[PDB]
Amino acid sequence: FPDHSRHLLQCLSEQRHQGFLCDCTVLVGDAQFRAHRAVLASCSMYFHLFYKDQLDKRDIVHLNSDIVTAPAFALLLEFMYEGKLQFKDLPIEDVLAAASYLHMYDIVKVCKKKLKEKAT
Amino acid sequence: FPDHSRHLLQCLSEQRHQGFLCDCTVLVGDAQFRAHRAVLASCSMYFHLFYKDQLDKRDIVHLNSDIVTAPAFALLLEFMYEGKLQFKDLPIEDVLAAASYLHMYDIVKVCKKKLKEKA
């Protein structure tokens, strides 16, 4: 039963990496990520607000945020479909910035505090 | 992190019970079920083939199968987000029939056969 949930999550991650049934296509910078709108909504509160504004039959065709690192955005999308304590070598500054812009899980910023405990 | 995956599955199931971002609306009998198309596609390979056929023509799923018990379909969607060998006192016959028509996980029909053999 729980292994079924993990396997359904993996299959949905494969469908998001291939592009099958992508209700939304979010592209902040030159790069373009496309996936289901409900996925980004359940993952990020900013996408949830976009879905609340899109309830009035708007088109989730695209979306752009300034000074939100696109590599960090891709890493955050992957982290929505992946595990915890994932540093992955990106700058914590842009990481916290993107996490806030997407209204992502606060634990990311908590890990940011851990980064502040890593240099002294 | 993985408990987060199970909880995200539960949250997506709550969103599917509410109806947010329903790319398809499947109604077999008198009842009408609405949820995300990608959910049914990831759940069932028959839905995957229907999605491959429907990719060229964005339509509402409105899929209907004769002699496929709609309560069994609702129980199948809910248990698809639940698992854990749920029987729900419904006749195993219609359950196995719908599961076979949908090409659901073989474990469903296997547990049906095990229950039919325990009697």
Curated annotation (Swiss-Prot), chain B:
Belongs to the krueppel C2H2-type zinc-finger protein family. ZBTB18 subfamily. Its main location: nucleus. This is Zinc finger and BTB domain-containing protein 18. It comes from the Eukaryota. Residues 22-89 form the BTB domain. It is linked to Intellectual developmental disorder, autosomal dominant 22: A disorder characterized by significantly below average general intellectual functioning associated with impairments in adaptive behavior and manifested during the developmental period. Additional MRD22 patients have limited or no speech, and variable but characteristic facial features, including round face, prominent forehead, flat nasal bridge, hypertelorism, epicanthal folds, and low-set ears. Other features may include hypotonia, poor growth, microcephaly, agenesis of the corpus callosum, and seizures. The keyword Iron-sulfur does not apply. Keywords: Developmental protein, DNA-binding, Intellectual disability, Isopeptide bond, Metal-binding, Nucleus, Phosphoprotein, Repeat, Repressor, Transcription, Transcription regulation, Ubl conjugation, Zinc, Zinc-finger. GO terms for cellular component: heterochromatin; nuclear speck; nucleoplasm; nucleus. GO terms for biological process: negative regulation of DNA-templated transcription; negative regulation of transcription by RNA polymerase II; positive regulation of transcription by RNA polymerase II; regulation of transcription by RNA polymerase II; skeletal muscle tissue development. GO terms for molecular function: DNA binding; DNA-binding transcription factor activity, RNA polymerase II-specific; DNA-binding transcription repressor activity, RNA polymerase II-specific; sequence-specific DNA binding; sequence-specific double-stranded DNA binding; zinc ion binding. Interacts with DNMT3A. Transcriptional repressor that plays a role in various developmental processes such as myogenesis and brain development. Plays a key role in myogenesis by directly repressing the expression of ID2 and ID3, 2 inhibitors of skeletal myogenesis. Also involved in controlling cell division of progenitor cells and regulating the survival of postmitotic cortical neurons. Specifically binds the consensus DNA sequence 5'-[AC]ACATCTG[GT][AC]-3' which contains the E box core, and acts by recruiting chromatin remodeling multiprotein complexes. The chain holds residues 3 to 121 of 522 of the full protein. It is found in: Nucleus. Lymphoid tissues, testis, heart, brain, skeletal muscle, and pancreas and, at much lower level, other tissues.
